[PDB]
Amino acid sequence: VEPVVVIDGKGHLVGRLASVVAKQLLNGQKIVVVRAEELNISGEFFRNKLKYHDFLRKATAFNKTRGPFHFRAPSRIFYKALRGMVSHKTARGKAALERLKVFEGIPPPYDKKKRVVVPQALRVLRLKPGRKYTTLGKLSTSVGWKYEDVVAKLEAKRKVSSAEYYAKKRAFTKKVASANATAAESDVAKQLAALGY
Amino acid sequence: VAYGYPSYSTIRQLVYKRGFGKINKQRVPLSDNAIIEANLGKYGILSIDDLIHEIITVGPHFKQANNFLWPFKLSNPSGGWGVPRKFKHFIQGGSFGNREEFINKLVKSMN
Amino acid sequence: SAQKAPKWYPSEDVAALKKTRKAARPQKLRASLVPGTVLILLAGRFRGKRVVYLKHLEDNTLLISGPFKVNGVPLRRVNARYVIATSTKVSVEGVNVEKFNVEYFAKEEIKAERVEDQKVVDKALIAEIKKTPLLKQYLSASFSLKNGDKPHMLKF
């Protein structure tokens, strides 16, 4: 439907975002996910910290290099959830994964692009209220992810340059909204009114 | 098995559509009324409906009339079975046993 | 010999076909196809062209016209199944169209008869097109699907 779909990761439940992102991929849809550090996980922080440590202890005994690899960054945590839902050793699986990019914060290009949201993985719509959950950047930091402060710093700055963007924009739609008002009551206008516009 | 009470409508549409005759074995399609009279005219019964009448009413010659009919070969129910698992009794939410006049909806989908 | 030779040869006498039972009965048209309806040509040379429906020809085709002065389509044959009949409609009750048969379009540049026949039909049409505003422009636009158009949804 669109060449690329930028997903604001914030507020989505990991495996559910991973699951729709996975299918989209395999159906030809390019996808980049942003703000992976504001991702959510059901269950409280401690459970998912433990869970991560369970994962953390598995490795090839005779050579901890060949064994499993434990990536700390919230994007890569997410990628792991996601690659688990793709036949990633097939060619078609590698095909589909190249159509995917995960990101902490919202870096260039995609910060000027509009990002969308996935209702069926939105935590605020999914989780029963009163349930406990986990933020991915908090989880990632407790297991050796370095860059939580640098990301929040760059994001706070980016949000500042964006609040201006919006502000200028809302100011201009006030003109357009005012323009369209005087054009209302005219002949074009009541005709379009008729045709549903 | 699943069985029940056939209605005239489903006996009619069974004989008409998938009704065949054992004639020197040779499972013969019923297609013409003269096929029947040749083999069942002995006992009355000289039309395809003369058959259905003998069947549905259980006449004096239901043995020879009913045996003249080859077993009916039905397909699987066209909308499915309705139950999740088949090999329980109808009463217990499966398909087998005597489901009485509910046999007609079953059979009509299998025809 | 190198090969023996068969005991039986199949006779080369060629049989004749059984007497088939297939009458060519006439083709009834879908109710949306009435003369003077605006079609959308879905495929072929003039694809996406909006065009006026005139006569149902004996070979099952449909007689259309641009009109040629509106959008460049001539009096032409078109297959009823490669067409969307719209709901918009001019009155064709002053168009000859009788002249036009299958043999008319035998293959056998443009015959002067056709160039004229085009003008006589067209003039009648235009005179009626002009009766509803913007219709003449519509008939010179091409139809295309825009983003979001859902054919199984759109009233035509």
């Binding site: 159906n27 | - | 199944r81 699907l145 054919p151 949804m153």
Partner: protein, 106 residues
């Protein structure tokens, strides 16, 4: 003007398959904006084309088309099964495909 499309956009999903055996004789087509079975019974019978490019020119073009037809609906979400003059090449899984408007009935 800018648009010219006379088809509905499509996507070649999978072959028809079980868990562990596919059937290359039936492709499964995802039609843009068709989301239920009832919506997709409109497209039954429409012709599909998978257009693709090639290096060897042929009949004076470097562009080739495999033609098919929607034949039946699939599942509950407006997926649709379709068959082609030659099965689609399984690399096409996730490629774009063109569902036309003919044989029309409007």
């Amino acid at each position: 003007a800018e648009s010219h499309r006379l088809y509905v956009k499509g996507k070649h999903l999978s072959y028809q398959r079980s868990k562990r055996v596919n059937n290359p004789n039936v492709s499964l087509i995802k039609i843009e904006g068709v989301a239920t079975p009832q919506d997709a019974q409109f497209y039954l019978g429409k012709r599909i084309a998978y257009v693709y490019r090639a290096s060897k020119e042929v009949r004076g073009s470097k562009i080739r088309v495999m033609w098919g037809k929607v034949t039946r609906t699939h599942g509950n979400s407006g997926v649709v099964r379709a068959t082609f003059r030659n099965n689609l090449p399984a690399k096409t899984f996730g490629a774009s495909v063109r569902i036309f408007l003919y044989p029309s009935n409007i």
